[PDB]
Amino acid sequence: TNLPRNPSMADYEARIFTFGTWIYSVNKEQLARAGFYALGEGDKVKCFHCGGGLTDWKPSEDPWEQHAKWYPGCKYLLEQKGQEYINNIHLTHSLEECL
Ligand SMILES: CC[C@H](NC)C(=O)N[C@@H]1C(=O)N2[C@@H](CC[C@@H]1CO)CC[C@H]2C(=O)NCc1ccc(C(C)(C)C)cc1
Ligand SMILES: [Zn+2]
C-alpha cells in the first residue's frame, strides 16, 4: 500500500552519496538517516519514502523533527520514530497556539 516513492534511494549509502558536495550547516549523516537525499539544487533534500522536500535549513534544526513537522504521513518516519514521536511534534505546536 505505502511503498517507497523512490526505492532507488532506500539504502543509507545511496543517500549519503548524494551529499558529496554538501556545504551547509546541517549534518549530512543526520539528513540521510532521516530518509533524505540531496538534489544538488541548493540545500534542497527529499525523503526517499514520502517524497517530501525540504529547504532553508538552520544550524540547530533536527532532520527527524522537520520530517515529522512537515510530512508526518511518511511510513519510514513511522517505522523509525513511532506514532508518539510524530503526534508529539504536532501536539507541541497546538499547545503553543493554545497558551
Ligand atoms: C528545513 C526546515 C526549514 N527551517 C525553516 C523549513 O521549515 N523549511 C520549510 C520548508 O522547506 N517547507 C515547508 C514550508 C516552508 C518552510 C520554510 O521554508 C513545507 C514545504 C517545504 C518546502 O517549501 N519545500 C521546498 C521543496 C518542495 C519540494 C521539493 C521537491 C519537489 C520534492 C524536489 C523540493 C523542495
Ligand atoms: Zn518521509
From Swiss-Prot:
| Glycyl lysine isopeptide (Lys-Gly) (interchain with G-Cter in ubiquitin) crosslink site(s) | K69, K75
| Result for mutant: H90A | No effect on interaction with SEPTIN4 isoform ARTS
UniProt superkingdom: Eukaryota
What segment(s) does the record annotate as region Required for interaction with DIABLO? 76-97
Q: Note the effect listed for W57R.
A: Reduced interaction with HTRA2
The parts of the chain that form a coiled coil are: none
**Record text on subunit structure and interactions:** Monomer, and homodimer. Part of a complex composed of SEPTIN4 isoform ARTS, XIAP and BCL2, within the complex interacts with SEPTIN4 isoform ARTS and BCL2, SEPTIN4 isoform ARTS acts as a scaffold protein and stabilizes the complex. Interacts (via BIR3 domain) with DIABLO/SMAC; the interaction inhibits apoptotic suppressor activity. Interacts with HTRA2/PRSS25; the interaction inhibits apoptotic suppressor activity. Interacts with TAB1/MAP3K7IP1 and AIFM1. Interaction with DIABLO/SMAC hinders binding of TAB1/MAP3K7IP1 and AIFM1. Interacts with TCF25 and COMMD1.
The entry's function note states: Multi-functional protein which regulates not only caspases and apoptosis, but also modulates inflammatory signaling and immunity, copper homeostasis, mitogenic kinase signaling, cell proliferation, as well as cell invasion and metastasis. Acts as a direct caspase inhibitor. Directly bind to the active site pocket of CASP3 and CASP7 and obstructs substrate entry. Inactivates CASP9 by keeping it in a monomeric, inactive state.
Q: Which disease is it linked to?
A: Lymphoproliferative syndrome, X-linked, 2: A rare immunodeficiency characterized by extreme susceptibility to infection with Epstein-Barr virus (EBV). Symptoms include severe or fatal mononucleosis, acquired hypogammaglobulinemia, pancytopenia and malignant lymphoma.
**Organism field:** Homo sapiens (Human)
What's in the domain note? The first BIR domain is involved in interaction with TAB1/MAP3K7IP1 and is important for dimerization. The second BIR domain is sufficient to inhibit CASP3 and CASP7, while the third BIR is involved in CASP9 inhibition. The interactions with DIABLO/SMAC and HTRA2/PRSS25 are mediated by the second and third BIR domains.
Residue range from the parent sequence: 254 to 352 of 497
Q: Please describe the organ and tissue distribution of this protein's expression.
A: Expressed in colonic crypts (at protein level). Ubiquitous, except peripheral blood leukocytes.
Residues in BIR repeats: 12-77
What does the PTM comment state?
S-Nitrosylation down-regulates its E3 ubiquitin-protein ligase activity.
Q: Where is this region: Required for interaction with SEPTIN4 isoform ARTS?
A: 9-24
* Residues bound to Zn(2+): C47, C50, H67, C74
Its annotated compartments are: Cytoplasm; Nucleus
Give the family per the record.
Answer: Belongs to the IAP family.
The name of this protein is: E3 ubiquitin-protein ligase XIAP
